[PDB]
RNA sequence: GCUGGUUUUCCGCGAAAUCUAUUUCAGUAGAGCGUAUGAUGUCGAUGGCCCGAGGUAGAGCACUCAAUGGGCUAGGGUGGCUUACCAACCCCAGGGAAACUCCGAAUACAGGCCGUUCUCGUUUGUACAGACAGACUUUUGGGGUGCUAAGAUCCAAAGUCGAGAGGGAAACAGCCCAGAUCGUACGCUAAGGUCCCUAAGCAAUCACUUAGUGGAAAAGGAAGUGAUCGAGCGAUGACAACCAGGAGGUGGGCUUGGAAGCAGCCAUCCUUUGAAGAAAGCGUAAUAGCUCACUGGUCUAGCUCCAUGGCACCGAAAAUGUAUC
RNA sequence: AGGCUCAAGCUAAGAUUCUGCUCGUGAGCGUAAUGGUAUAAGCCUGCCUGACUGUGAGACCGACUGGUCGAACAGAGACGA
RNA sequence: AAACCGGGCACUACGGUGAGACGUGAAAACACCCGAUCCCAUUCCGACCUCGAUAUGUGGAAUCGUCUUGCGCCAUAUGUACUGAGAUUGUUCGGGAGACAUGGUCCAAGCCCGGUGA
């Protein structure tokens, strides 16, 4: 899933908005050091906003991705490339459009801070769940430290053995090592169940 | 749905914005979720109505209800005092009585969040709100 | 709606002035922002004289 | 800090603390660098000499010296901060009354 | 019983900027308690006002600890 | 202090309807604003640099008030250990506000220094007064309002008018352009316009709509049309379409004076297995049945829904006569 | 002149309670509100009476009448080493 | 001597601030250990301050300076919110936060006084 890109050399208001118009979206990629210094892009708004909707996860930024940076014309010219990860996605409050994609450099294996979410999996069988145990899922989506190679692509929880009153901690998460939660205390839920009303 | 305890009371008025804190939000407390397009204001039995009309729309398909719940917060109350002079009376003489409140609702707030197991029948209760609502709204999600 | 402030439509030979003044100041701001040094960089006559 | 220049400048202010081994004392300019005096029992020609060099004999004692080492240097008037917790009683009268009969006017 | 009333406007603030003259007896700034502490060759009224005491420019002076600002003065 | 009247001519300049006070509102004085002249002024006009405390729009919850969900519970209640019944506290999220501030811009403003500039346009002396009832922007941002803005009222800054004629807005104080010394059957624009009334293109180039939309008015409804990214489909045949049962446990179990699919509840489970739910709708006093999800070949071909969106449509009724280009 | 640091939260303890840790302006200031303040303007002890006569350079704001702050001078004084 | 360590002054928020684990003195230095006699301490009390004594006891990690995580600011990125001047009843030109992101939590500078060989 290659992205392709062309640079810009704008700020703020007046040109990001031609480029929007004409479909168009204005990113940045850096790396992880300060001032924070690489090329300021912009991805085509076609790419980005079909892409997100076909991850299907509304943080898909959990996945590393890799650019092609055309410096040239026609379709492209082989130029500069990216292994960046997208830390921020800044969504359009109006109707769902796109405004800005932000990628950090990971390509040399460094250590990120990135989002991975909770996916509920054991929900087909579960006692409380068969006495019709329903929940409050306090922790939808969580960030992790850890390296750029290894990244998961996500979190896919065991709660096959939800107890009828019990819960699953950060803890409990099928982690790896290096990739050290650390960034929160284990003793947040992020489920429960109650048996509420039959 | 009301600030019962005290305030300061007699809100200036106080015009009503184009647009929201600016970055795109999320969900705050459950799955699927609505939001408002265009701004405005919704008074407190407007919005209680909707309310009415979500969860008695759910216990209406208990069938998909009778499981547990089917949990839903909105998540908008009423703050501004709307005041009003009888309906005849010199203007001025100072101002009106408190008659209702309202709600400054902005371009992206999220009015009802919920996780009703189906999607099915949660955006079949997304278009059954701006029936009963003042604005325009849309079926967001997590 | 006492008395009638008619609402002139924009028109396309109104378009026409619109443009007019915006290629106008777009020279303007065009030498100003040349003239960031006491130099001489604009290329000789720009229109300015069709502006008609 | 301290003073909130008010009017007249005065720089030469005396200042002394006490550790319990030796009693120091200093009277320093605004440049606050080069200690206009530097009065101190640890000195090297005051450690054999003064005996008890924590009491209030070595401290009027240091008072004395310095007064004189003043009244000869020509800064015949200072200001003095005493420290947070100080107050003129005991070794800080000490350093106070013998500086003020050496023949300074503070 | 009724609202409606108000009090002649008492002129409090700060008149002299960064750098503005100031000449002995010529106040500074205006106010209710303290909001600027004095600094350099400045006196205090009983409202507190503050008003210079040498020739020369002032500045301010923001103690970036406690956020506690003063105005002091920059004579010859 | 109220109403009306004040008779010749030319030229020069040229305001105000704001503030304070008042047995004050319909007045009049004092400031600001006009004029004449003289004196004292590079004073003013302004742009650039520099530097100066700002606490508004925004913002956020770090405080006060209101506040949503959750975690664990003091403490309660309820029976006798223990409670899906209350749970404070504390913590996690979320984030409200003229009288909240962890933060916080664009401005505007104080000043010095430089250019810019003039017919001093400055300050001030000395004599004259006018004015103290102001309107408006389908401007923009604010209090009262109808409900959130009456051609209202009352303020913030702007402009026009008033005291401003002239071209556009069909006609039009308050909007667009623009300041008439005078003569000229001269000339290039401005404002807006070029099928005709009306001076000037049925101009050209690329597409869109066929509603008189244009040439008035919303929630909602509605395969409109043409573009655009997706995707699902397809000579293991894509859809249209012909031809065929929807079975036996089964008429499930329950109700029931009657229920087999359908007055009405549980049940969604058995198996045959070509299909099949304890038949969807309709009913039949139960019936039966359909057809329904659910069918084999033939079809012979680009089909279908996803939105980026563009211009259409419907809602859309007044009074003498089309009467909203 | 000098000394003293609040209020709230947690342990004991639970009363005019008590004493440390955390808290950071939320206490306190006769009196509404706001701006103030941790040396403090607050609380305590001693002392007294400058809750002085006669002037005030300069400034702030204001139609005007006016009103506000003031470094400084002379005096008789208080507190303080 | 150059330099180091300790003590005092000074400067500084990247130079602060808790937090916790450390490494710890005696070579010198600072602190503490011990009393309360006169000066001081208490609205009761050496708890805190003070005064009076330690000839080499402890760093009680009491403070302390030390070692690294971790504690606010400093610096800046993409944007958005807001806004200036504009009228194509805002298709232009500028200015641009809060929050999200990243990284640093300095390179450095004195003066005196004692000490380590000098």
Same mark, same amino acid.
């Given at each position: 899933?290659?992205?392709?890109?062309?640079?810009?050399?704008?700020?703020?208001?007046?040109?990001?908005?031609? &480029?929007?118009?004409? =479909?168009?979206?204005?990113?940045?990629?850096?790396?992880?050091?300060?001032?924070?210094?690489?090329?300021?892009?912009?991805?085509?708004?076609?790419?980005?906003?079909?892409?997100?909707? %076909?991850?299907?996860?509304?943080?898909?930024?959990?996945?590393?991705?890799?650019?092609?940076?055309?410096?040239?014309?026609?379709?492209?010219?082989?130029?500069?490339?990216?292994?960046?990860?997208?830390?921020?996605?800044?969504?359009?409050?109006?109707?769902?459009?796109?405004?800005?994609?932000?990628?950090?450099? !990971?390509?040399?294996?460094?250590?990120? @801070?990135?989002?991975?979410?909770?996916?509920?999996?054991?929900?087909?069988?579960?006692?409380? *769940?068969? @006495?019709?145990?329903?929940?409050?899922?306090?922790?939808?989506?969580?960030?992790?430290?850890?390296?750029?190679?290894?990244?998961?692509?996500?979190?896919?929880?065991?709660?096959?053995?939800?107890?009828?009153?019990?819960?699953?901690?950060?803890?409990?998460?099928?982690?790896?090592?290096?990739?050290?939660?650390?960034?929160?205390? #284990?003793?947040?839920?992020?489920?429960?169940?109650?048996?509420?009303?039959? | 749905?009301?600030?019962?305890?005290?305030?300061?009371?007699?809100?200036?008025?106080?015009?009503?914005?184009?647009?929201?804190?600016?970055?795109?939000?999320?969900? =705050?407390?459950?799955?699927?979720?609505?939001?408002?397009?265009?701004?405005?204001?919704?008074?407190?039995?407007?919005? /209680?109505?909707?309310?009415?009309?979500?969860?008695?729309?759910?216990?209406?398909?208990? $069938?998909?209800?009778?499981?547990?719940?089917?949990?839903?917060?909105?998540?908008?109350?009423?703050?501004?005092?709307?005041?009003?002079?009888?309906?005849?009376?010199?203007?001025?003489?100072?101002?009106?009585?408190?008659? =209702?409140?309202?709600?400054?609702?902005?371009?992206?707030?999220?009015?009802?969040?919920? &996780?009703?197991?189906?999607?099915?029948?949660?955006?079949?209760?997304?278009?059954?709100?701006?029936?009963?609502?003042?604005?325009?709204? @849309?079926?967001?999600?997590? | 709606?006492?008395?009638?402030?008619?609402?002139?439509?924009?028109?396309?030979?109104?378009?026409?002035?619109?443009?007019?003044? *915006?290629?106008?100041?777009?020279?303007?701001?065009?030498?100003?922002?040349?003239?960031?040094? $006491?130099?001489?960089?604009?290329?000789?006559?720009?229109?300015?004289?069709? %502006?008609? | 800090?301290?003073?909130?220049?008010?009017?007249?400048?005065?720089?030469?202010?005396?200042?002394?603390?006490?550790?319990?081994?030796?009693?120091?004392?200093?009277?320093?300019?605004?440049?606050?660098?080069?200690?206009?005096? $530097? !009065?101190?029992?640890? /000195?090297?020609?005051?450690?054999?000499?003064?005996?008890?060099?924590?009491?209030?004999?070595?401290?009027?004692?240091?008072?004395?010296?310095?007064? #004189?080492?003043?009244?000869?240097?020509?800064?015949? !008037?200072?200001?003095?901060?005493?420290?947070?917790?100080?107050?003129?009683?005991?070794?800080?009268?000490?350093?106070?009354?013998?500086?003020?009969?050496?023949?300074?006017?503070? | 019983?009724?609202?409606?009333?108000?009090?002649?406007?008492?002129?409090?603030?700060?008149?002299?900027?960064?750098?503005?003259?100031?000449?002995?007896?010529?106040?500074?700034?205006?106010?209710?308690?303290?909001?600027?502490?004095?600094?350099?060759?400045?006196?205090?009224? @009983?409202?507190?006002? *503050?008003?210079?005491?040498? #020739? +020369?420019?002032?500045?301010?002076?923001?103690?970036?600890?406690? +956020?506690?600002?003063?105005?002091?003065?920059?004579?010859?």
């Amino acid at each position: 899933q290659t992205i392709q890109a062309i640079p810009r050399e704008a700020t703020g208001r007046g040109v990001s908005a031609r &480029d929007r118009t004409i =479909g168009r979206i204005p990113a940045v990629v850096f790396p992880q050091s300060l001032v924070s210094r690489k090329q300021l892009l912009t991805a085509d708004k076609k790419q980005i906003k079909s892409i997100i909707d %076909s991850v299907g996860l509304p943080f898909f930024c959990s996945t590393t991705f890799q650019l092609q940076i055309r410096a040239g014309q026609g379709s492209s010219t082989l130029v500069e490339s990216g292994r960046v990860l997208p830390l921020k996605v800044h969504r359009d409050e109006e109707t769902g459009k796109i405004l800005n994609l932000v990628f950090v450099w !990971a390509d040399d294996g460094e250590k990120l @801070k990135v989002d991975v979410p909770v996916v509920f999996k054991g929900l087909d069988h579960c006692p409380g *769940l068969q @006495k019709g145990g329903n929940l409050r899922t306090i922790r939808s989506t969580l960030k992790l430290l850890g390296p750029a190679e290894h990244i998961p692509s996500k979190i896919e929880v065991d709660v096959s053995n939800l107890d009828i009153e019990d819960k699953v901690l950060l803890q409990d998460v099928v982690f790896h090592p290096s990739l050290k939660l650390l960034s929160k205390n #284990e003793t947040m839920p992020v489920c429960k169940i109650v048996a509420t009303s039959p | 749905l009301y600030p019962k305890r005290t305030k300061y009371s007699k809100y200036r008025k106080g015009r009503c914005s184009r647009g929201c804190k600016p970055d795109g939000t999320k969900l =705050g407390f459950g799955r699927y979720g609505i939001k408002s397009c265009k701004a405005g204001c919704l008074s407190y039995r407007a919005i /209680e109505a909707a309310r009415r009309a979500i969860i008695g729309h759910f216990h209406r398909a208990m $069938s998909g209800q009778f499981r547990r719940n089917g949990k839903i917060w909105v998540r908008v109350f009423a703050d501004l005092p709307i005041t009003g002079k009888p309906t005849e009376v010199r203007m001025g003489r100072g101002k009106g009585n408190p008659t =209702g409140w309202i709600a400054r609702v902005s371009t992206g707030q999220i009015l009802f969040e919920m &996780d009703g197991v189906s999607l099915a029948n949660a955006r079949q209760a997304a278009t059954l709100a701006a029936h009963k609502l003042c604005l325009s709204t @849309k079926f967001v999600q997590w | 709606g006492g008395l009638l402030w008619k609402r002139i439509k924009l028109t396309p030979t109104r378009k026409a002035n619109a443009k007019t003044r *915006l290629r106008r100041v777009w020279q303007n701001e065009a030498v100003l922002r040349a003239c960031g040094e $006491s130099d001489a960089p604009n290329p000789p006559g720009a229109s300015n004289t069709k %502006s008609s | 800090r301290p003073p909130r220049l008010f009017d007249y400048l005065k720089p030469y202010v005396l200042k002394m603390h006490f550790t319990n081994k030796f009693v120091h004392a200093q009277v320093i300019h605004s440049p606050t660098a080069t200690v206009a005096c $530097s !009065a101190s029992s640890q /000195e090297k020609a005051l450690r054999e000499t003064m005996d008890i060099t924590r009491d209030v004999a070595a401290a009027s004692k240091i008072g004395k010296i310095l007064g #004189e080492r003043l009244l000869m240097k020509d800064i015949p !008037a200072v200001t003095i901060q005493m420290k947070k917790e100080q107050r003129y009683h005991g070794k800080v009268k000490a350093v106070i009354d013998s500086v003020r009969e050496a023949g300074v006017k503070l | 019983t009724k609202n409606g009333r108000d009090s002649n406007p008492k002129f409090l603030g700060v008149k002299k900027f960064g750098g503005e003259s100031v000449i002995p007896g010529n106040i500074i700034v205006r106010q209710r308690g303290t909001r600027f502490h004095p600094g350099d060759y400045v006196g205090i009224g @009983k409202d507190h006002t *503050l008003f210079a005491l040498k #020739e +020369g420019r002032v500045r301010f002076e923001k103690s970036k600890i406690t +956020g506690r600002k003063w105005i002091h003065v920059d004579p010859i």
